[PDB]
Design a protein around this ligand. Sequence first.
Ligand SMILES: Nc1ncnc2c1ncn2[C@@H]1O[C@H](CO)[C@@H](O)[C@H]1O
Ligand SMILES: Nc1ncnc2c1ncn2[C@@H]1O[C@H](CO)[C@@H](O)[C@H]1O
Ligand SMILES: Nc1ncnc2c1ncn2[C@@H]1O[C@H](CO)[C@@H](O)[C@H]1O
Ligand SMILES: Nc1ncnc2c1ncn2[C@@H]1O[C@H](CO)[C@@H](O)[C@H]1O
Ligand SMILES: [K+]
Ligand SMILES: [K+]
Lengths: 331, 330
Amino acid sequence: SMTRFDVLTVGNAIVDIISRCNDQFLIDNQITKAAMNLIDAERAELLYSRMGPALEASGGSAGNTAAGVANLGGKAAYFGNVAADQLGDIFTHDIRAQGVHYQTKPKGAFPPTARSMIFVTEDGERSMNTYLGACVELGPEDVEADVVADAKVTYFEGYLWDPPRAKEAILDCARIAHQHGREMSMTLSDSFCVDRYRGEFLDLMRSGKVDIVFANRQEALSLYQTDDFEEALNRIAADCKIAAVTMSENGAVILKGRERYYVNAIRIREVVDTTGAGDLFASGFLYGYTQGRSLEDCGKLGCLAAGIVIQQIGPRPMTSLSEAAKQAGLI
Amino acid sequence: MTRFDVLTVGNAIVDIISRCNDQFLIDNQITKAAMNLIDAERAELLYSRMGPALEASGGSAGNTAAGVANLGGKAAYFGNVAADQLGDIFTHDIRAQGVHYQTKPKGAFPPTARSMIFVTEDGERSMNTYLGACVELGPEDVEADVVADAKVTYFEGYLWDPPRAKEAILDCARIAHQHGREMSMTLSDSFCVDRYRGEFLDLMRSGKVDIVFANRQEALSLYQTDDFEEALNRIAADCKIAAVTMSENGAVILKGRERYYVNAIRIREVVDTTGAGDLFASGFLYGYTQGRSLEDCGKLGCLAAGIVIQQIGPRPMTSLSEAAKQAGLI
Ligand SMILES: Nc1ncnc2c1ncn2[C@@H]1O[C@H](CO)[C@@H](O)[C@H]1O
Ligand SMILES: Nc1ncnc2c1ncn2[C@@H]1O[C@H](CO)[C@@H](O)[C@H]1O
Ligand SMILES: Nc1ncnc2c1ncn2[C@@H]1O[C@H](CO)[C@@H](O)[C@H]1O
Ligand SMILES: Nc1ncnc2c1ncn2[C@@H]1O[C@H](CO)[C@@H](O)[C@H]1O
Ligand SMILES: [K+]
Ligand SMILES: [K+]
């Protein structure tokens, strides 16, 4: 039975730069609200010059998910490329300190470590502005084949389709994972990311390279270019073995063939910062999944972790998810 | 018209913040509630044992300048960072708050100072500081026109650790007083006071410092006494104005024989005490440079301090001017 890892995740290694803003700031700066907005180095400088005093926290969607799995008690690993700089050192420290295996080697100091300027509005929504930096170097050379072979699930970001060579690494992961009887999972990441790579994402699912897909409502609607959510659910269920579809305050639904399992969102005192919600939903789900739990219980664990992360600043819970899961009887 | 209300001078530091259990401090021989100086090797070692962290611009005087600006006052800062990413963060955050900050980095080594701050379940903070580029702060960093044009110049007792910062401070005191401005200092930390007791007393008695900030522990340390009433009597005799904080018991402001007691504000929970004294000084000095009564200066200080301890991060993320308006202090 013994496997070295429950979950390997693969993504853009990013440090977040976080500030609260008013609604007008997003309009003035033509930032798309609630989305991941890619930016070049010049725009990164410009936006930073306009940003208020900030807090820094290690981020990266898949990075956050790996950290969450480790926090819950699972065995996690991560592939993602930073630079040999202070931001890279922060990223390396934080993920390793959480007890995630992280061994991707920087290639030099330039391009520098990716950062995302995340603007949080009063409603708690987050709008991200990401300079990919050293993420553009992630490639097949960064696949630790022994780790993929020894991970129950390898999970990756749709966001990896933006940098040039990351997709080649992911295809290598899929080959190795499936040769060793493991499963592959992806998140659709962002509705505009889906707009960019819709055909390629559908191909990953239909060809069986991806077994388990994570989406939110917006991403699922985007995937099929529909405004009919019921259509989106029917189609996603036909395109992948298992789909986990989140619906913000309305909880989540897990699909497997004709099976549907609806889960409620937890009670929130107040939505502080939604950054990381989907990532931590994936942590909870994948932790449950690799512990042999029912699909419903995987959904419950996802909703618990996501509800915790949106009540704090920072994309990675600072409290014990295992303790919260125990208190909730999810164990 | 004067360009600045408050110029502060201190060690420019980025904070690296994590919550820990009580045993961690014991295992690592970290003095609880204190500023613990560390070398580069110890910084690497402690970081290797620290959990996932959050980074936020810090530096005691940096936080104070940011708080004055937040309240609506006009603030400037002198402090030295390196030409590196942490220095860029520090530079951005203080300038983004509307603080004049023009100190030029001198190189990439030593790198920008950082302090690993461990917050225990009681909200207490224990700081472990590698001074880095702070050791390079000297007289060359004094913007004489800024000192000349600031109502109050305020500095950290912490500046007595790096080698040449005290020379910059003596130059500031000269310029400030030549232009009829006032000088202020904070005693910073009780162990810092133990290190520089005689020098601090000399700054006060010689008139180089006009307004002194202390907490209870610092005041007791200054006179090596267990008697808080003795410490208050003595500190009042040694400086023109003393502002002495007493944590949950508020503060007392002393001027000659005058004493003004002020209450702590009501709080939801002590999340992280980092910055409490810094922000008390922000509120006090903001009030002081707006011509407010010493009691109202104390009340502004207690408001700002009470806000900062209810959040993670040494610099309030909320509007202090709005809070002051709501509390009817402005
Ligand atoms: N292009 C990107 N790829 C992967 N993660 C990203 C991207 N932009 C922002 N993020 C991360 O998304 C997280 C929230 O899901 C943040 O912690 C942030 O670092
Ligand atoms: N407003 C909200 N209230 C409760 N949970 C939420 C909210 N927004 C997001 N979530 C949680 O985050 C997940 C992904 O958005 C959801 O499935 C849900 O569990
Ligand atoms: N040696 C030091 N000099 C000045 N400020 C410091 C020192 N060590 C820690 N600090 C700062 O003290 C602040 C809290 O008062 C923290 O934000 C931290 O950066
Ligand atoms: N427990 C507390 N409750 C309210 N205010 C506090 C507390 N601890 C410290 N402070 C504030 O911070 C200042 C410096 O410690 C005090 O004068 C006080 O105003
Ligand atoms: K969050
Ligand atoms: K604080």
